Write a protein that binds this ligand. Structure first.
Ligand code: XMV
Ligand code: FPP
Ligand code: 3FX
Ligand code: 3FX
Ligand code: 3FX
Ligand code: ZN
Lengths: 318, 497
């Protein structure tokens, strides 16, 4: 059974402070006895600004019941730095939270502040933890954003070696092999190969990248993630669309990869984003009437959910 | 008016093709397709007058949804402790949904709303997620509280607006304590940095007349660098400093470059488009840095689902449709469309998304099954909640009513603005942080006010799927409150009438 904190010897000197809602608040929550009691004493602790081990224990009790309680996370971090607590132990506690499905923006931000303050000479073991943590949800948005932050922050300090970037691309390639429709891994590939300040831009790398993109499309012709990456790639590097059109035309019915001579089964034609490529190719050649006819068919036949948008594109040609 | 907005029931429903390559994404997609398409098959087509015998009627069950929200004014069960740091959002989701549904609160209930929120306001500046003796201020509760006071408050001594006016300097000071040199904001002391914070802060600063040059410096650059190769926006951008290997990675005001930190998402795309749009009103030199509006419009329309998934919006590529993205993605469409319109104008009409299919998703798939708790939800198989009720209805409103930002309305607003009326200027934190002089400050006030009141519903652009009893009220793009709340609220703080 529950022992209230008013009956605990360790807390006898503390006068709890009630929540100040006013007389008849809207959206009141029927708090458990444990949560109300803990917050009553947290209000007193935070009022006197006590930085102590019992305050530390109290914050953990509260964030286990409400992991999105940003005020108590803020107080917890100031406790850790004020008491000079082991930040590696706290990091292990955050690993347990994930295992126990205690999750929020506030937990992920707490993890970031820990890594920033520890400031490891080599973050390799945190990188490897983040990779493993993606197994139950390979698209967790907070995890992917944290991974971006980790590599960006520690590369700014000069602490990401070339071997580490190489194994990160290897891991990214494996993620996309296991699920080519994981748009989060495509986004990561873009950071690794295009946007990060240390990425190489040569004629070899552009050719390699285009080969990878085209092979990905031929493996899964209806994969929107791959089509968007192709269009972003060409646009970002100001590359013409026409020379690649041979690899795309079979989907609208030389050197770079071509579609399979028998197309994969369950590949109904035409692929609407292939038609968009063709239309934009016509615009590149100043053949505005040929582009307009493709947009018209996208609008009335092949991508009718977007009929108004494709009609907007058709009119732009005139 | 519906030539280019075909009904879901008039189109062929087919699964997303597999290309003979199974994956976990496709398993989940196909399972969701079966859930939504089976409910559509059980439901009478809303566009038909001969409702099939035996099939479910899809009319908007406004009274069920009203009673769903009624618990907010009595008590919430213990499970809501997970939102105990977001109680202003529980208020906002409730009172904005009632506005959209056309249900009035009596004055005593409004007074309770006002009093509750004012107990969340700290004298040092800003609203927290609960009482000021319990929680520190936070940018997101500050937006939710300010909008809720626009909806439920008034200009009398018990109406809460006069307390907001007296708090303007302290709120501004909170905003400046949140400010980072690279243009981001922390959401609270020691908190995370993303475009949700920028959006919530710019709405409140716009409404309360507390914008200054020092507050806005680099804010446009932070947001612009969140745009990804897909055309939507990520949560944040990272500022790399001028010197490669650096002894510090803390943000700086003159980075060598900025890089987006995750994939495009409907929630962050909504915040980014809305923030950028608010910044275009501000008369600073070569400000705001531009975005690729055409890419953002393309990304927006590509997130509308296929007929087999009922025409709802998904939040990101290769994830699932979800009713709440009717607001986050659908509600960004008029903003993206207006920015595209300005780009075309600078270098020298059919609807841009399927307005009909989005309403069919709301009516058929996103309502709780009839005769039950009421409320709206993510998708079939999910419990309804206040957050999906608000955002389903906000998105339905944008689909029903054709919204646009009207240059002639903005011109009329400029002609009527009275620059000799206003509340006291905020005192900047740094000596040179304010406007250069009174001509500059009054010009800024005029532009920001006149553009904030520039959104109109286009005459004859209404489309109410299923008949006029499904009509809800018109929300405003960018702020997401009714225009009839926005106008008296912003007029109070700029002393216009
Ligand atoms: C009643 C419970 C709803 C839970 C929602 C909303 N939600 C939340 C809680 C408190 C304030 C708030 O603010 C605002 F977004 F404006 F509503 C938003 C969350 O945390 C988690 N969600 C899960 C969710 C449902 N469908 C899509 N998602 C993804 C998602 C949406 C928004 C944010 C953010 N941020 C993060 C993730
Ligand atoms: C004003 C304000 C606070 C705006 C924010 C709105 C908003 C919807 C933000 C979404 C952020 C996010 C991490 C979504 C992913 O969650 P998920 O993986 O659970 O859902 P998903 O599968 O749809 O992406
Ligand atoms: O939110 S709605 O679905 O429109 C309202 C509910 O259906 C209530 N239905 C009642 C049934 C008995 C007769 C009076 C109406
Ligand atoms: O006077 S102010 O500083 O403006 C407002 C109060 O001091 C806020 N103090 C609370 C104590 C308990 C934790 C949450 C904050
Ligand atoms: O105004 S119109 O669009 O011509 C048609 C009305 O809105 C019909 N609404 C229905 C009436 C009977 C009960 C269920 C709703
Ligand atoms: Zn949702």
């Amino acid at each position: 059974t529950y022992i209230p904190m008013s009956q605990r010897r360790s807390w006898a000197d503390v006068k709890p402070i009630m929540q100040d809602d006013g007389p008849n608040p809207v959206v009141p929550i029927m708090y458990s006895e444990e949560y109300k009691d803990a917050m009553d004493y947290f209000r007193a602790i935070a009022a006197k600004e006590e930085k102590s081990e019992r305050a530390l224990e109290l914050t953990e009790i509260i964030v286990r019941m409400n992991p999105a309680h940003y005020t108590v996370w803020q107080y917890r971090f100031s406790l850790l730095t004020s008491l000079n607590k082991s930040l590696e132990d706290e990091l292990r506690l955050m690993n347990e939270f994930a295992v126990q499905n205690l999750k929020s923006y506030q937990v992920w931000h707490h993890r970031l502040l820990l890594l920033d303050r520890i400031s490891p000479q080599d973050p390799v073991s945190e990188i490897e933890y983040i990779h493993g943590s993606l197994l139950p949800d390979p698209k967790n948005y907070h995890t992917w954003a944290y991974l971006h932050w980790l590599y960006s922050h520690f590369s700014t300090l000069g602490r990401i070696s070339e071997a580490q970037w190489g194994s990160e691309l290897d891991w990214c390639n494996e993620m996309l092999r296991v699920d080519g429709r994981n748009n989060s891994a495509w986004g990561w590939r873009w950071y690794l190969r295009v946007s990060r300040p240390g990425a190489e831009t040569s004629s070899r790398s552009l050719q390699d990248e285009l080969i990878y993109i085209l092979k990905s499309i031929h493996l899964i012709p209806h994969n929107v993630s791959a089509w968007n990456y192709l269009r972003g790639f060409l646009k970002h590097f100001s590359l013409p669309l026409v020379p690649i059109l041979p690899a795309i035309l079979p989907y609208t019915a030389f050197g770079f990869p071509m579609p399979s001579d028998p197309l994969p089964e369950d590949t109904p034609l035409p692929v609407p984003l292939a038609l968009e490529y063709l239309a934009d190719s016509f615009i590149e050649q100043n053949r505005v009437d040929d582009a307009a006819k493709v947009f018209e068919k996208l609008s009335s036949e092949y991508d009718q959910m977007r009929a108004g948008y494709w009609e907007f594109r058709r009119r732009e040609c005139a | 008016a519906t030539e280019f907005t075909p009904s879901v029931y008039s189109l062929v429903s087919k699964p997303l093709p597999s290309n003979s390559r199974p994956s976990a994404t496709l398993d989940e997609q196909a399972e969701t397709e079966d859930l939504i398409s089976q409910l559509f098959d059980l439901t009478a087509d809303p566009n038909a007058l001969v409702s099939e015998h035996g099939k479910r009627y899809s009319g908007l069950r406004k009274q069920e949804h009203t009673q769903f929200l009624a618990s907010s004014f009595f008590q919430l069960p213990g499970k809501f402790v997970s939102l105990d740091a977001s109680r202003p959002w529980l208020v906002f989701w409730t009172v904005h949904s009632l506005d959209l549904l056309g249900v009035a609160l009596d004055q005593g209930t409004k007074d309770r709303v006002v009093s509750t929120l004012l107990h969340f306001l700290s004298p040092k500046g800003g609203f927290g997620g609960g009482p000021a003796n319990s929680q520190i201020p936070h940018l997101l509760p500050t937006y939710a509280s300010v909008c809720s006071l626009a909806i439920a408050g008034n200009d009398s001594s018990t109406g809460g607006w006069k307390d907001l006016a007296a708090a303007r300097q302290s709120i501004y000071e909170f905003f400046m304590r949140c400010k980072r040199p690279d243009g981001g904001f922390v959401v609270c002391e020691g908190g995370e940095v993303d475009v949700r914070g920028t959006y919530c802060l710019l709405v409140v600063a716009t409404l309360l007349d507390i914008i200054t040059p020092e507050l806005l410096h680099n804010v446009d650059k932070f947001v612009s660098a969140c745009q990804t190769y897909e055309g939507g926006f990520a949560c944040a951008s990272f500022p790399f400093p001028s010197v490669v290997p650096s002894t510090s990675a803390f943000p700086t005001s003159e980075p060598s470059c900025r890089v987006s930190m995750a994939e495009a998402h409907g929630g962050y795309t909504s915040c980014s488009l809305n923030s950028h749009f608010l910044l275009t009103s501000v008369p600073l030199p070569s400000f705001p840095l531009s975005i690729d509006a055409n890419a953002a419009l393309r990304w927006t329309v590509l997130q509308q689902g296929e007929p087999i998934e009922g025409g709802g919006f998904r939040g990101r590529t290769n994830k699932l449709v979800d009713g709440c993205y009717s607001w986050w993605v659908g509600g960004g469409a008029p903003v993206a469309e207006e920015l595209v319109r300005r780009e075309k104008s600078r270098k020298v009409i059919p609807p841009i998304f399927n307005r009909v299919a989005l309403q069919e998703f709301t009516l058929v798939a996103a309502q709780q099954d009839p005769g039950s708790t009421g409320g709206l939800r993510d998708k079939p198989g999910k419990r309804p909640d206040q957050y999906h009720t608000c955002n389903n209805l906000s998105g339905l409103s944008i689909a029903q009513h054709k919204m646009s930002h009207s240059p002639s309305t903005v011109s009329s607003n400029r002609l009527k603005f009275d620059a000799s009326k206003g509340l006291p200027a905020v005192k900047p934190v740094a000596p040179g942080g304010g406007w250069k002089n009174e001509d500059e400050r009054q010009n800024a006030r005029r532009e920001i006010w006149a553009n904030a009141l520039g959104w109109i519903e286009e005459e004859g652009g209404e489309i109410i799927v299923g008949g006029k009893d499904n009509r809800i009220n018109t929300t405003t793009p960018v702020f997401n409150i009714l225009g009839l709340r926005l106008k008296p609220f912003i007029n109070y703080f700029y002393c216009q009438e």
